[PDB]
Amino acid sequence: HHHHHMFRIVVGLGKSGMSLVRYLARRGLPFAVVDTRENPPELATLRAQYPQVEVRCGELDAEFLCSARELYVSPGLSLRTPALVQAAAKGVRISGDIDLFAREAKAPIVAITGSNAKSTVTTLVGEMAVAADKRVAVGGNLGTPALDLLADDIELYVLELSSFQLETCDRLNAEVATVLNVSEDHMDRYDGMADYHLAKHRIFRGARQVVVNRADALTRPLIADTVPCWSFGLNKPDFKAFGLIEEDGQKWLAFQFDKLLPVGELKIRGAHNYSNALAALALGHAVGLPFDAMLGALKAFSGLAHRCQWVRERQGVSYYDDSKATNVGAALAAIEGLGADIDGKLVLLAGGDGKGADFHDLREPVARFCRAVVLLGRDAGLIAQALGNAVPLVRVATLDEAVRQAAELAREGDAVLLSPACASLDMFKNFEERGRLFAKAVEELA
Ligand SMILES: CC(=O)N[C@H]1[C@@H](OP(=O)(O)OP(=O)(O)OC[C@H]2O[C@@H](n3ccc(=O)[nH]c3=O)[C@H](O)[C@@H]2O)O[C@H](CO)[C@@H](O)[C@@H]1O[C@H](C)C(=O)N[C@@H](C)C(=O)O
Numbered sequence: 051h052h053h054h055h056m057f058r059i060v061v062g063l064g065k066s067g068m069s070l071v072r073y074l075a076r077r078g079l080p081f082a083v084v085d086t087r088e089n090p091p092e093l094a095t096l097r098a099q100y101p102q103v104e105v106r107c108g109e110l111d112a113e114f115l116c117s118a119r120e121l122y123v124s125p126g127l128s129l130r131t132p133a134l135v136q137a138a139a140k141g142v143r144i145s146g147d148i149d150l151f152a153r154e155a156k157a158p159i160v161a162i163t164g165s166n167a168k169s170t171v172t173t174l175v176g177e178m179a180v181a182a183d184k185r186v187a188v189g190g191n192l193g194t195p196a197l198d199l200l201a202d203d204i205e206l207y208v209l210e211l212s213s214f215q216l217e218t219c220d221r222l223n224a225e226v227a228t229v230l231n232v233s234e235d236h237m238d239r240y241d242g243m244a245d246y247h248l249a250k251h252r253i254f255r256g257a258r259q260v261v262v263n264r265a266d267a268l269t270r271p272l273i274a275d276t277v278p279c280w281s282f283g284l285n286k287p288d289f290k291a292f293g294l295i296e297e298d299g300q301k302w303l304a305f306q307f308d309k310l311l312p313v314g315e316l317k318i319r320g321a322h323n324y325s326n327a328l329a330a331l332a333l334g335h336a337v338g339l340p341f342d343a344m345l346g347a348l349k350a351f352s353g354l355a356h357r358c359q360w361v362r363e364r365q366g367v368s369y370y371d372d373s374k375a376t377n378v379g380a381a382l383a384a385i386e387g388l389g390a391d392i393d394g395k396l397v398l399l400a401g402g403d404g405k406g407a408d409f410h411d412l413r414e415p416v417a418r419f420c421r422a423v424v425l426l427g428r429d430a431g432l433i434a435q436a437l438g439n440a441v442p443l444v445r446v447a448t449l450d451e452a453v454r455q456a457a458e459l460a461r462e463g464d465a466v467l468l469s470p471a472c473a474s475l476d477m478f479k480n481f482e483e484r485g486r487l488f489a490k491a492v493e494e495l496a
């Protein structure tokens with residue numbers, strides 16, 4: 051079983067695996083593809099587009115993996131998979147598409163992770179860079195695989211990174227890096243908060259600057275003492291800091307003692323979105339984006355689909371798609387934020403794959419803001435146990451039923467909120483499909 055000394059193996063045939071196939075094939079390197087599943091989602095794609103690439107589907111063959119110089123592992127595949135552990139112990143480098151991107155990119159990287167907000171802040175910094183007339187490429191976990199962004203004329207890369215991707219990134223060497231926030235998530239993969247936190251802090255390896263959340267200690271890296279450190283927060287900022295300046299009850303986004311923009315001139319609203327705006331300003335300022343360009347993009351920014359997104363108002367009841375809420379921290383923010391905005395109470399739709407999360411933090415906000423909760427999905431029962439008898443709970447089987455029942459529970463002035471605190475993967479392809487099907491059911495109400 052001979053192989054070339056450059057031989058490498060792509061482990062996982064999903065979207066990032068296909069970006070690795072494209073990259074390695076373009077460089078004419080010897081490689082093969084494996085996947086633990088008999089019928090991975092991009093198998094048909096690989097067979098149609100790369101009929102000559104060796105592909106092995108099923109139980110991983112550790113002896114085959116051990117013949118490669120490096121494995122590029124799908125971020126969704128746990129590195130505790132036994133054959134990967136065995137290859138690692140025999141000195142095979144465990145890598146991945148972000149690790150490879152970091153080793154190849156020829157322009158500064160803005161690297162953004164966090165338990166929440168990383169897609170919004172990544173998108174915003176990208177729009178700031180476009181407004182600053184930079185040749186920018188934006189992607190990563192956000193959707194466009196990072197390797198597909200590579201081009202020599204790119205002046206700035208903006209990457210959303212997951213804790214999973216970061217586990218195989220040896221030395222990202224970002225120009226500026228941030229962990230926006232950390233709250234319990236992905237506890238079906240990590241043993242606890244310590245390993246989850248450590249994985250995210252790999253974003254700082256080699257970072258030339260950092261952006262830190264003054265309100266979240268799990269975002270503060272050791273290197274904040276040795277590289278330029280820009281902080282954001284909602285309190286009044288000090289030197290080198292972004293924050294809010296308040297005068298006669300009017301709030302301004304601010305850098306040090308300079309008022310930048312009244313928060314009322316943003317389209318996005320609420321404390322979490324102000325924090326996101328300040329984080330994006332800090333990241334953009336770190337890579338030289340002019341303030342006037344950044345503020346113009348901030349004023350124009352409308353937010354992302356499935357982020358507490360208004361769908362419909364029917365019989366005085368408004369319907370909001372917050373399907374992006376796949377952890378408790380996100381649902382907490384939406385319940386508090388929308389609950390405080392409306393002239394009524396919430397009917398919350400929640401449940402799905404809870405990833406081993408503690409749901410106890412939902413109880414008090416649900417008791418304060420909800421008229422009822424509609425629960426679906428694999429871990430509906432765990433959520434119901436955490437909520438107790440705070441409010442009426444209605445158990446349903448499908449999202450269409452959940453919407454029909456929520457309409458019946460709601461009264462004029464209420465809002466129906468899909469903010470599930472769970473992954474969608476037990477019942478849906480992804481959280482975007484979950485949100486699209488919620489919006490479809492809402493639109494089908496008579
Ligand atoms: C799960 C994950 O990390 N997905 C990211 C990945 O998409 P990709 O299609 O390559 O997925 P993947 O890494 O193959 O994982 C998908 C699923 O396949 C399974 N899988 C994968 C390989 C394999 O051999 N066997 C197997 O069972 C994984 O366990 C997982 O359940 O690469 C894309 C490009 O970088 C990302 O946009 C996408 O992020 C999505 C948005 C996501 O859900 N990310 C998670 C981490 C999140 O945000 O929490």
Ligand SMILES: [Mg+2]
Pocket residue numbers: 165212235236
């Ligand atoms: Mg995640």
